């Protein structure tokens, strides 16, 4: 496949919705690369819509694990989740393509989830404190304050390319081999 | 001619035999050894038992580690330092039982996979390759002292964690013997004292690769 | 026969641009970068478009190529897949006779539900959307943006024959045989 | 698989409900054939319902396109889109079997697609161009005079082999090479 | 080769997916695979899992306690109800857990309405009380909690951070990061 | 090869799923090939079903006792209906189940209600009643009851444990771990 | 390979499922080939099937009376109408099924309305007549019973044990068991 053809030259491919079966797809791509070469980078194309907050940081803990460090590229779109696994590649590195919309907000529930109060004190504290962990992990690798990222993940953020440079989502901008 | 091994055996019984890169063998070769370890014979082609009862059999292998070296394993773990090393033999005693049939393994008085060099004693293999170097230049009417920044420069150099006192070899070989090499072929170091001293003295700390070593000779 | 044109270097687009097919056609282009990065990528182009970040990902990555890309419109070429047909190199840039280039300003499929504050959101993205829709679709045919605004009010569909007048496309692709 | 063996053989199938999957196989199928032998003949079989514009055009303009002159085969039915198709095939060609029907009428919107009346006003002069150039098509491959065709097509036109020969759909309704 | 027949090879089982009836039957079949293979050399599971399933759970922590290699339970990015159970299941000195995982641990529930008559009621909650306290009961010689607070702890979600379901006895070691990125 | 080809291999069936026609005839096709190719060592079958399925049911139980070769049954986190009969239906001296293995035997049921008239709906009662008596005298000759403790203890929804399956003579021995954990 | 191709590679064909368009076209094509590789060595065809449709019954009747090869069909755990008739179908000296299969014979059904004006009724009236009276005459000469029997039985449900569909003619044998287990 030509999939196969970018794992063999060590590139992870996100491309899907961030789920339980994309999270795990990735965290093995993204472990055996460790073992193949640690000391060569992983790159890793993201076309993501995002979703999924245990997903995420699932990738984004192997991510952070492996000793290869991780060149994110974003594609056409790093959208919720896929923004934050971004944002989580090493410094120097996390490019984006100059089109691509690069979208920070706040942790959803996808649909409504039933209770007593005593159940939704803990899925709403569970909400927050995952927004909390998505301010925090969006903080050191963009350089802003948490409550900056939590003013401005309030509603949909949508950055372009140039202006996720600007937001420390990613580092540059990437250039076209030819101008076509 | 009764083979190698049998006759430089039967010549001298008390030997050391040293079976350098065992798992570069085919697999036959083993089995031929196999009653060399629980027997000490080996019966060569003319018919004579050759007595491997008074040698000692030393195997040496790089099973186990002819990749694994490569830090990191494929997966999460705690750990990395003695980890790493048990790691490593938990990899190599896999890889041998792998390698070898359990029989050959089973005759085997003791396998010892060996540590990784750490950085303390790599500072002590450069005192032991000087010493190689200055026992040459004993032969040239010279000396060579190497100071203690010297020794350390060597040191940090040399030290790589997964190999080990073959890139000091080099090391010591690109930095002091290829320069200085050239110094005797200037005469600038002919029967005198190479000292050897650090010049940018890479602060003794931190990366020393824009320092330098210089060689001159006094007395 | 799909194997057959990726070894003679022809992408195909094929199908509606979603995330599915815009994933398949980077690794397309990138695969046939890393083979001959000098001979030129062909990509046809049947699409019914949709997708304006399956678009920018199609199209950032056939920009990003140094192999050039001939787009050939085969039956239609829509929304999306109109501005990928425009997105191919000078000179280049084919279409069939009877080929239907359709453009037209981005939609939502279905109503998106929210707060004022989110809906504001959305709408400015929509228009961020439709700005850079006319901002690619202007540098690619040489219109002025105002005109591929007021152009793609509507649908506006194009054949061939008035595509390569749009600048959509350069040359209306003539027939090898008559039959 | 025998559509192999007739693939091999220079025989692109239709078979199916053109659309756009349908299309773009074929499309695939005449040009490997075209690369594979450009001088010598693509035989085309249909037994098709017909529908889909674009799709027909893509189709019809390949079919045009190769260097390899198009037999088409109508097999048991040719039925819009699919009939202009059968008499796209190169004139001296364009067989049909005699219990074959062909179908001709003019385009449809398979269901209503809603708008206001400018977007409604565009449409409708799409339907009239997808109707004139299927008139056009289906007049230099007949031979009819386009408002012919437009009087014919006006409502399902089912022509027998026999007069669909007799209408320039096809050229000779095939003889069968054994009684049986 | 799949990404995961090279973990499969380098003995890690993967959880991944909702603990089923399809997902138990597999995990049990490559505990016993790597069990004939290297029975003195550890199996890592790797655990994603949303949980879920008490007779599908105690099939995959009966297996993972029955094979001689010990079992080094990875939480990946979440370790919920049957999952939870299953990455405390490890062995201890092992048990890893990623910085950002999620343990929650909660009380078995029945997943939609049971009907029956008020004796076929009376024994589907003696069962789901038997399995509310086998589950306290096997998360308290995994925790070294005392089982009573297993259930005034798993009263109602009880989520768990790493390094809180470290101090919890869920897992033993938050797994620190090869390189810091 | 696939974790379940291994299993297959060192003649282990494997139930797993749902006992209805689909998978009757596949461990039936199992059966009989570990048959074929010995007929004297001894084929294990794991039991991770939650049962139904009365032909179903007698379709396995039938093979696995026409078969030359001992079964050992396995039950692995459930054996429910038809396959905790399937689980007594082993040979004695076998039949283990894991420690939490949940041993479920009832009554047959009718999933869902079957229409006719009365003539029709007498011989789907006595239909049913030969099936119950036919799934009670099974469990007797496997057991060592007298049925009529079985049709007394399979009136209502009867769960055992693993440590009480052995005791009710459905299992032999509960499986004691290799290591600890 | 699968157990099923193993099974068929020694001559055992294998209904299994339900009787329709689909799995009488299968065993038709599973008989010929058998056919064509040994013509006197006998094909196996087991049976665990719920039956349904006539047409694909009579498909797969007519195709294993038309082979040389003679057919030792097998009762597994069911074979309900049309099942029940390729069961009595095999050869005689021949046709085992194994002691708790489940033997059902009952005349053929409309499985659900079909409308139409009193005249296209009366004629597919005229055919589920004529499916009765070719379901009851073919289970005649291979039960050796009169059709009118035949008729008075099937009409309702007539569920056979294995023990009494020898009695009944429908099997020959009932299958003993090779290991006592
Ligand atoms: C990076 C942050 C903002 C995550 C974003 N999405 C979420 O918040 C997702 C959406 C979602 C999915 C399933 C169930 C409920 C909610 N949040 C979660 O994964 C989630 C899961 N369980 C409880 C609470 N939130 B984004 O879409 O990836
Ligand atoms: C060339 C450009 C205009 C592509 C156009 N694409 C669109 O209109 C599509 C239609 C669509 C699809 C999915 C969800 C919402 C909307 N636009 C988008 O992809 C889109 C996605 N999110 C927000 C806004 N628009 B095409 O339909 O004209
Ligand atoms: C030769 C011409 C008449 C082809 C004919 N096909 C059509 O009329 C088809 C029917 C159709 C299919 C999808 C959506 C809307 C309409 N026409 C079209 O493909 C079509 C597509 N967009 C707008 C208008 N018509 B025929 O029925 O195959
Ligand atoms: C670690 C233990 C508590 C596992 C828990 N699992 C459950 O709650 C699940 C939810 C469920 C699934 C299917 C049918 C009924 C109920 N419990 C069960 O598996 C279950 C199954 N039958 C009866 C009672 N409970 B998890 O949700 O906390
Ligand atoms: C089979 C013995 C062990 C007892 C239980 N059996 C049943 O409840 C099952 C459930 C069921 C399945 C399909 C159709 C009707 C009923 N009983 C039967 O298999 C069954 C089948 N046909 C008629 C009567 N009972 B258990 O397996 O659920
Ligand atoms: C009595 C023997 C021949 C078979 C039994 N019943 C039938 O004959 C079956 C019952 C059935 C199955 C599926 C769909 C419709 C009807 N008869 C038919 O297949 C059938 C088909 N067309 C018209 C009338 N009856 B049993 O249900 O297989």
Redesign the interface.
């Known amino acids: 496949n030509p999939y196969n053809k970018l794992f063999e030259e060590r590139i992870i491919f996100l491309g899907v919705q961030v789920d339980d079966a994309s999270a795990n797809d990735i965290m093995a791509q993204l472990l055996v690369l460790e073992s193949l070469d640690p000391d060569r980078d992983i790159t890793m194309y993201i076309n993501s819509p995002g979703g999924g907050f245990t997903s995420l940081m699932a990738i984004y803990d192997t991510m952070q694990y492996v000793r290869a460090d991780i060149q994110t590229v974003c594609l056409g779109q790093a959208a919720s989740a896929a923004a934050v696994l971004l944002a989580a590649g090493t410094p120097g590195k996390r490019m984006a393509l100059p089109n691509a919309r690069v979208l920070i907000h706040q942790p959803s529930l996808s649909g409504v989830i039933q209770g007593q109060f005593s159940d939704l004190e803990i899925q709403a504290a569970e909400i927050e404190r995952m927004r909390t962990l998505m301010e925090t992990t969006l903080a050191r690798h963009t350089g802003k304050d948490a409550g900056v990222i939590r003013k401005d993940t309030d509603r949909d953020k949508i950055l372009t390319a140039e202006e996720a440079k600007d937001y420390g989502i990613i580092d540059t901008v990437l250039e076209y081999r030819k101008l076509s | 001619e009764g083979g190698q091994l049998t006759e430089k055996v039967r010549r001298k019984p008390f030997s050391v035999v040293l079976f350098d890169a065992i798992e570069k063998a085919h697999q036959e070769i083993y089995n031929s050894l196999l009653q060399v370890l629980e027997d000490g014979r080996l019966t060569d082609g003319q018919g004579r038992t050759v007595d491997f009862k008074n040698t000692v059999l030393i195997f040496t292998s790089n099973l186990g580690t002819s990749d694994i070296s490569?830090?990191?394993?494929?997966?999460?773990?705690?750990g990395?330092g003695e980890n790493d090393y048990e790691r490593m033999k938990?990899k190599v005693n896999?890889e041998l039982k792998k390698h070898f049939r359990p029989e050959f393994l089973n005759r085997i008085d003791d396998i010892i996979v060996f540590h990784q060099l750490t950085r303390e004693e790599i500072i002590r293999m450069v005192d032991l390759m000087i010493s190689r170097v200055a026992g040459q230049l004993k032969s040239k009417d010279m000396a060579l002292v190497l100071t203690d920044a010297a020794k350390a420069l060597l040191a940090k150099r040399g030290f790589d964690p997964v190999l080990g006192a073959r890139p000091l070899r080099r090391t010591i070989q690109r930095e002091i013997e290829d320069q200085l090499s050239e110094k005797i072929l200037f005469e600038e170091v002919g029967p005198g004292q190479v000292v050897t001293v650090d010049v940018d003295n890479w602060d003794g700390e931190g990366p020393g690769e824009d320092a330098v070593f210089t060689f001159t000779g006094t007395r």
């Open positions: 490569k830090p990191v394993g494929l997966g999460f773990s705690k990395g938990q896999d």
